[PDB]
RNA sequence: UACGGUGCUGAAGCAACAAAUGCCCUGCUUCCAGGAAAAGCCUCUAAGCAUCAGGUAACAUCAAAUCGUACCCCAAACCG
RNA sequence: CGAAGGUGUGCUGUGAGGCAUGCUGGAGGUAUCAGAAGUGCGAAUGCUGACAUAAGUAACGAUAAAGCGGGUGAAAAGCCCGCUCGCCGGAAGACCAAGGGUUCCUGUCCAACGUUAAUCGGGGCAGGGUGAGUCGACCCCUAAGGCGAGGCCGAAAGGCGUAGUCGAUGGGAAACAGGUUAAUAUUCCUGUACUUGGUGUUACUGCGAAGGGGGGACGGAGAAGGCUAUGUUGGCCGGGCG
RNA sequence: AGGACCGAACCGACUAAUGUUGAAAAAUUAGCGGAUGACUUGUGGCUGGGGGUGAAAGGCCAAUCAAACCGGGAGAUAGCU
RNA sequence: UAAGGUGAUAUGAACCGUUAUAACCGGCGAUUUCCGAAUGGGGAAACCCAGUGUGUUUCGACACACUAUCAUUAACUGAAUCCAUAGGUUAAUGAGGCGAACCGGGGGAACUGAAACAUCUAAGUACCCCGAGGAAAAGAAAUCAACCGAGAUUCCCCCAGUAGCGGCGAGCGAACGGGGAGCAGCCCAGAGCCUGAAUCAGUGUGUGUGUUAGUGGAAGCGUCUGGAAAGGCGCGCGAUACAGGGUGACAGCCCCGUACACAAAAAUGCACAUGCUGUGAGCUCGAUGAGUAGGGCGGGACACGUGGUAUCCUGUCUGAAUAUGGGGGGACCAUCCUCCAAGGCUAAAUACUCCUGACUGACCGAUAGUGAACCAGUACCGUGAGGGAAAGGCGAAAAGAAC
C-alpha cells in the first residue's frame, strides 16, 4: 500500500520487493497470460504496488 | 473502398513536321 | 583567417567602379605577412600574421602591449 | 543473485501454442514467450531459478510479426522473441 | 452536479412518472428506470446472449430532461448546495430541505 | 530494359543518410525542413 | 490408416573404364603491361618484471554472446 | 396548424426578376429602408468533381496445345485428386546474394483484388512459423575512399588534410553427413567431430612491446600431367517374363 | 604469341519485319557484330550545374539536358494570345 | 475536486471505490529505455563495441557510476637545449545544439523598371551565414541652430514628394524645423578625503498583489399544437447575471455556465520589506583616449551616382595638435557662434508573433477556410531534396432492424 510501505525502513522494503515482483506478480503474470482464471483485475494492482516500493527507499535516501 | 488515381502528362507525339 | 590580429581587420568588400562605372564586388584584403616579432620580455618569436599598417602599430604602441592584447581579446596567442 | 531480478523479469508469459512446441513437448523440451531482451545466458539462468527445469542451451529467435487488421489503417504486430528452452533433464519434472 | 435520485422527469412521455436514477453517465446521460424504455432487439449469439426476443432496455436519457422529485411536491424547486458540514451538502433550495 | 530504379540499401543509407546529413549546416537545414514541415518518413530506413 | 498416407522391416551396396571449364594450381612454363594492403600467424628483443608474472605443452573444467536465417530469388513477393 | 432549399403551376413586371400557390422537405428564414461585398458565368485546350460518348466496340498480355474421369461444393472448361497428352531442361530446374518484407505454411471465407468464371489464389480473416560456438553479418584486420584530434588555409558557413578511426566488394580461428517440422535446417535431433577463448590443475621454462624482421602475399595467357566429383559399362543383388 | 580467326556464354545494337491508343514511355522475332580485351560485369567508391564527364554527339549527368531538379526572389516580366 | 469510475476508436470483460486518503484536476518530486546536440569509441538514426573504477561473486558471471570535444581557469609534469618555454597529463568550471518570426553584424543578387540596355533601378531587398535578446540595436554631442538660442538616444505623425541628387532618363528622396509618445544619467583612463555611503547586481528571507487548481453563484408554472416544447396562447417571477453553448423545434427562470462573490498545499511573475554578498558612489584637485584624426590613393554609407561636394565608415600609404589647443557649421579661407572625438555602459517610449490564455469579427461553413473539421503533412508521388491529396453529418435517442 501507500503509507504502509512509507513507514517501512530501507532494509525491509528491499527484501519485500523481490517478492512482490517475483512470486507475487510473476505467478499472476504467467497464469493470466494464458487465460487460467480470468482474474484480470489483479494485474493492475500489484504492478502499481511494486512501483511504489521502488519509489520509496531510494527517494528516502536509505530510510 | 480504397482509391488511387494519378494524372498523366507524357507525350503522344512521335510524328515529325511537315515541309521545313 | 585574414585578420590583422593587431586590430583584426576583416576584408571589407565593395564595388569596383571603372572608367565607365562598372560596379562588381571584389574584396579589399589587408596586406598580411607572417612576421616574427621579438618580445624581448620572454625573448622569443611570436610569428603573428599581421598587416603592414599593423606592423607600424606594434612598433609604435610597443611589443608587450599588442601581446597584452590578442590573448585578452580571444584569439590565439 | 548472479544477475538482477530485472533480468529475472524477461519471462512474461508462456507460449507453447500449437505445433513444434507441442510436438516438441511431447518429444522433449518446453518453449515460452521471452521478452525481446536479447540474450541466451540470462534466459538459461532464468528457467533455472524461476522454475527448476534443467537446461543446457537456449535457442533464441526473433518473431518479427506480420501485417494485420484494419483497411482503415494497415497495422503490423509488435515484435518479440520465442525461445526454445532446450530442457536437459527437465523433461521428466 | 446534483444527481446514485428521486426524479419525476421534465420531458413528456414521462412527465409525472418516477424512478431511481441508477448512475450518472459521463456523456451528459443518466439512467432513469421504467421511463427510458427502448425495445432493444437482442440478437442471440453463443456463449451468453442466449435469449432471442426484442427485449426491453432502459436506454439512457439526458440529464437536463430530468426534473427532480421533492417530498411534498412533484415538481422541483432547484437544489442549492452550499451548506458546510465539512463539505457541500444538498438541499432543495427555497425550503432547504437537507436532502 | 535497364530501368532507373535499382535499389541498394547500402548506397541509399550512405548517400541520403540521417547520419550522412549530420555534419554540415546545409545537411542540417534539411532535417529542419522535414520536421517543422512535419514530414515523417525520414530517410526511409529501418 | 482417416485414405491425406504413415510405421515395421531391409537385400546387394562391388569392379573397370571415361572424365570436367572442377581440385593440386594464387602451381608450373612463358610473356610484357610487371602484377593490393594490414592484421592475425611465427620469431627476435626494448622499457620492464623476478620463488612472481607471463610464455609453451597437457589435462580438468567451463564459455563462445548478438542479429540475419521464413519465403520469393531470371521473378506473379525485386525494378518498370 | 410547416421556414429555406428542391420540384411543378398561375398571376405579374420593360427587364434583371418578383409575387401567390400545390407537391417534396423538416427546420430556420427574413418586409422595408439604408450600409458593405469573395455580388450574378457558356465559353479562358479554364480548374475540381460527377457522369456520358466512341461501345457493349477494341482488347483480354505470348504460335509452350490440353483432354477426360472423379472430388467438393449451390454453382467446375480453368480449381483439388487421378490418368493420359504436350513444353522447358546451362532452365521455364536447384542453392544463394541483392532487393522485397510475410508475399511462406495451415485452417477458414469470396464483397472488393486476380484483366474471365472462381469452390481456387501470392486476396480477406484467423492462426501457426524463421531456432547456430563452427554458416553468414556483427566481430578482428585493413583497401580504394571517407570522416578527421592537433594543424594550415578560408568573410563566415567552410575547405583540405596529419596522428587516428572508420569503410568490403578482399583478408582472419573453426562442422560435416544423415533423420526430422503442415511449412525449419550445415542451425533442432541423431551419429561422429572440430575450433577458439577463459579459468583452474599440473609440469616445464626467460618472458615481454603504439617495437624489429619474416610470413601472410597474390598478374595474364598458355601448356600439360596428376586427381576426383560424376558419368558410362559390366559385375553383383533384388524384381520381371510380357 | 596475337586489341589473331570461326563461334556459345556474356556484352552490344547493323537490317528487316511486328508493334507503334503497344505485351512494353525503346521492346519482341528472325537474322547480325564483338568475344580473354582499348573486354565485360557485380560490389563499393569518386567527380555537381556555369559545373562535371565526354574514343567528342552539344551527347550524357535519375524515363527530363545548348545549362538538371527543388525551394525561394516570384503573383518575375509579356506593348503578346 | 469528488460519488462514481477503469483516456479514444469500442465495445465488452473482470474488478475498484461510494461522499473520510477511489476516480478526476493542478503544483512539486520521482522515474524519465534506446536514438537524436548525443558526448567513453564506432556507426547503415532508433545499432555495435570498449577502457577505468565501486562492487557483488553462489565463483559462474553480472551490474552500477564515470570516461567526448572545445573555451577559460587552476594544478601537475615537462622537449628539442643547462635553463626556460613549447608541449603533454589532470582537475574545476562555462560553452556546444534545437526552433517560427522579429532584431544587429558579416556577406549579397538577378529578373524587373528605365517601354531596349550598360550608369541608375530593383535593393542593400530577397537569400545564405554569424550572433543575441525579449525586445534588439542606438545612446548622454568633437549634435544642431543662426548671431536668438536648443541640449542624450529611440520611435510615431509631419515637415515635404519639399530641398536636392539623377544615363538630370526612369527614379531615389532627406534633413533643418515642428507637434507628440516617452524621458535617468554615469563611470574608467588617479592621487586622495570619509572610507558598503548612494547605487545596482546576486543571494536571501518576508509583505502585499497576480497567475497556475478551482468553488459557490440567481429566478416558472399552466395550458394548446406537436414524435418531443425551449414554439403559440395565458398567468407570473429573478436580474451587478437577458455573454454564450448545450438539453427532442427558437429557453433570462431546464442544465453547464454567467456577472458577482469567493478560493491555494505548493511553485513562480510582479512590485515593495529589510539582512548579507559583491559594485562602486558622495566632496578636493588632476586627468580628458596616436599609428589616431586629417591628408594622398581606392571604395562604401549619407537622399546625394565625385559631380562644385562637405561629412561619416574604412582596405592601402602616411601622418597632426594636445584646451594661449582641437572639431564642426555641405567647395574653401577669414570672421563669428557652438561643441571637445579617437575608452566604455544604460531603462523606457517602439517593432515582431512560432507559442499560451481570454475575447471578438458585416471572416469562412466542407471544391470555402490552413495543405488539413474526418487517425494530415497522413495516404500517395519522387532516388532525393521535395511535392502532396481525398474523405465532414443516420436519428431525439442506437433504440444499428428480434423474427
From Swiss-Prot, chain A:
Q: What happens when the gene is disrupted?
A: Cells missing both S17 and L29 grow very slowly and have a rather unstable temperature-sensitive phenotype.
Q: Which molecular function terms from Gene Ontology are attached?
A: rRNA binding; structural constituent of ribosome
Q: Which InterPro entries match?
A: Ribosomal_protein_uL29, Ribosomal_uL29, Ribosomal_uL29_CS, Ribosomal_uL29_sf
| Assigned GO CC terms | cytoplasm; cytosolic large ribosomal subunit
Instruction: Give one GO biological process term.
Output: cytoplasmic translation
Q: Subunit structure, briefly?
A: Part of the 50s ribosomal subunit. Contacts protein L23, trigger factor and protein nascent chains. Might also contact SecE and probably does contact SecG when the SecYEG translocation complex is docked with the ribosome.
Say which family it is in.
Belongs to the universal ribosomal protein uL29 family.
Any idea what this protein is called?
A: Large ribosomal subunit protein uL29
- What does the organism's lineage look like at the top? Bacteria, Pseudomonadati, Pseudomonadota, Gammaproteobacteria, Enterobacterales
**Gene name of this polypeptide:** rpmC
Curated annotation (Swiss-Prot), chain D:
This protein's record includes keyword Lipoprotein = no
Subunit structure as annotated in this protein's UniProt entry:
Part of the 50S ribosomal subunit. Contacts protein L29 and trigger factor. Might also contact SecE and probably does contact SecG and SecY when the SecYEG translocation complex is docked with the ribosome.
Q: Which residues cross the membrane?
A: none
Q: What is this protein called?
A: Large ribosomal subunit protein uL23
Which InterPro entries does the entry link to?
Nucleotide-bd_a/b_plait_sf, Ribosomal_uL23-like, Ribosomal_uL23/eL15/eS24_sf, Ribosomal_uL23_CS
Which NCBIfam families does the entry mention?
PRK05738.1-1, PRK05738.1-3, PRK05738.2-4
Superkingdom of origin organism: Bacteria
Q: Which gene encodes it?
A: rplW
Picking any one GO molecular function of the record gives: rRNA binding
Curated annotation (Swiss-Prot), chain E:
The UniProt entry, under InterPro entries, shows: KOW, Rib_uL2_dom2, Ribosomal_uL24, Ribosomal_uL24_CS, Ribosomal_uL24_KOW, Translation_prot_SH3-like_sf
GO cellular component, as recorded: cytoplasm; cytosol; cytosolic large ribosomal subunit
Q: Name one GO molecular function term.
A: structural constituent of ribosome
Q: Which Pfam families match?
A: KOW, ribosomal_L24
Q: One of this protein's GO BP terms?
A: cytoplasmic translation
Q: Which UniProt keywords apply?
A: Ribonucleoprotein, Ribosomal protein, RNA-binding, rRNA-binding
- The set of disulfide-linked cysteines is none
**CDD domains from the xrefs?**
KOW_RPL26
UniProt lists the family membership as follows: Belongs to the universal ribosomal protein uL24 family.
Q: How does it assemble?
A: Part of the 50S ribosomal subunit. Might contact the SecYEG translocation complex when it is docked with the ribosome.
| Function (record text) | One of two assembly initiator proteins, it binds directly to the 5'-end of the 23S rRNA, where it nucleates assembly of the 50S subunit. It is not thought to be involved in the functions of the mature 50S subunit in vitro.
Q: Which NCBIfam families match?
A: rplX_bact (TIGR01079)
- Protein name per Swiss-Prot or TrEMBL: Large ribosomal subunit protein uL24
Protein's organism: Escherichia coli (strain K12)
From Swiss-Prot, chain F:
Q: Superkingdom of the source?
A: Bacteria
Q: Which InterPro entries match?
A: Ribosomal_bL34, Ribosomal_bL34_CS
Q: Which GO terms describe its molecular function?
A: structural constituent of ribosome
Query: Which processes are annotated in GO (biological process)?
Result: cytoplasmic translation
Task: Name the keywords, alphabetized.
Answer: Ribonucleoprotein, Ribosomal protein
Carries keyword NADP? no
Q: Which GO terms describe its cellular component?
A: cytoplasm; cytosolic large ribosomal subunit
| HAMAP family referenced in this protein's UniProt entry, alphabetically | Ribosomal_bL34
Give the record's family classification.
Answer: Belongs to the bacterial ribosomal protein bL34 family.
How does this polypeptide assemble, per the annotation? Part of the 50S ribosomal subunit.
Name of the protein in question: Large ribosomal subunit protein bL34
Upper classification of the organism: Bacteria, Pseudomonadati, Pseudomonadota, Gammaproteobacteria, Enterobacterales
Which gene underlies this protein? rpmH
Amino acid at each position: 500500500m501507500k503509507a504502509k510501505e512509507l513507514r517501512e525502513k530501507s532494509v525491509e522494503e528491499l527484501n519485500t520487493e523481490l517478492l512482490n515482483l517475483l512470486r507475487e506478480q510473476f505467478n499472476l503474470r504467467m497464469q493470466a497470460a494464458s487465460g487460467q482464471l480470468q482474474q484480470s483485475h489483479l494485474l493492475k494492482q500489484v504492478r502499481r504496488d511494486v512501483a511504489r516500493v521502488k519509489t520509496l527507499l531510494n527517494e528516502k535516501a536509505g530510510a | 473502398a480504397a482509391a488511387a488515381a494519378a494524372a498523366a502528362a507524357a507525350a503522344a507525339a512521335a510524328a515529325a513536321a511537315a515541309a521545313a | 583567417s585574414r585578420v590583422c590580429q593587431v586590430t583584426g581587420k576583416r576584408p571589407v568588400t565593395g564595388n569596383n567602379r571603372s572608367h565607365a562605372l562598372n560596379a562588381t564586388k571584389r574584396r579589399f584584403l589587408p596586406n598580411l605577412h607572417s612576421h616574427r616579432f621579438w618580445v624581448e620580455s620572454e625573448k622569443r618569436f611570436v610569428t603573428l600574421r599581421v598587416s603592414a599598417k599593423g606592423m607600424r602599430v606594434i612598433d609604435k604602441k610597443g611589443i608587450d602591449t599588442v601581446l597584452a592584447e590578442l590573448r585578452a581579446r580571444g584569439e590565439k596567442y | 543473485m548472479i544477475r538482477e531480478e530485472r533480468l529475472l523479469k524477461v519471462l512474461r508469459a508462456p507460449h507453447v501454442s500449437e505445433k513444434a512446441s507441442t510436438a516438441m513437448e511431447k518429444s522433449n523440451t518446453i518453449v515460452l514467450k521471452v521478452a525481446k531482451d536479447a540474450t541466451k545466458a540470462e534466459i538459461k539462468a532464468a528457467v533455472q531459478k524461476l522454475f527448476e527445469v534443467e537446461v543446457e542451451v537456449v535457442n533464441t529467435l526473433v518473431v518479427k510479426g506480420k501485417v494485420k487488421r484494419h483497411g482503415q489503417r494497415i497495422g503490423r504486430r509488435s515484435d518479440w522473441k520465442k525461445a526454445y528452452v532446450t530442457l536437459k533433464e527437465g523433461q521428466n519434472l | 452536479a446534483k444527481i446514485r435520485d428521486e426524479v419525476i422527469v421534465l420531458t413528456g412521455k414521462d412527465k409525472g412518472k418516477r424512478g431511481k436514477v441508477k448512475n450518472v453517465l459521463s456523456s451528459g446521460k443518466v439512467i432513469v428506470e421504467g421511463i427510458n424504455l427502448v425495445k432493444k432487439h437482442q440478437k442471440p449469439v453463443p456463449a451468453l446472449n442466449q435469449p432471442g426476443g426484442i427485449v426491453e432496455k432502459e436506454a439512457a436519457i439526458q440529464v437536463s430532461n430530468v426534473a427532480i422529485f421533492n417530498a411534498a411536491t412533484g415538481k422541483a424547486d432547484r437544489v442549492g448546495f452550499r451548506f458546510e458540514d465539512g463539505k457541500k451538502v444538498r438541499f432543495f433550495k427555497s425550503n432547504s430541505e437537507t436532502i | 530494359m535497364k530501368r532507373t530504379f535499382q535499389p541498394s540499401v547500402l548506397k541509399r543509407n550512405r548517400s541520403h543518410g540521417f547520419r550522412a546529413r549530420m555534419a554540415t549546416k546545409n545537411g542540417r537545414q534539411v532535417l529542419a525542413r522535414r520536421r517543422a514541415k512535419g514530414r515523417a518518413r525520414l530517410t526511409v530506413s529501418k
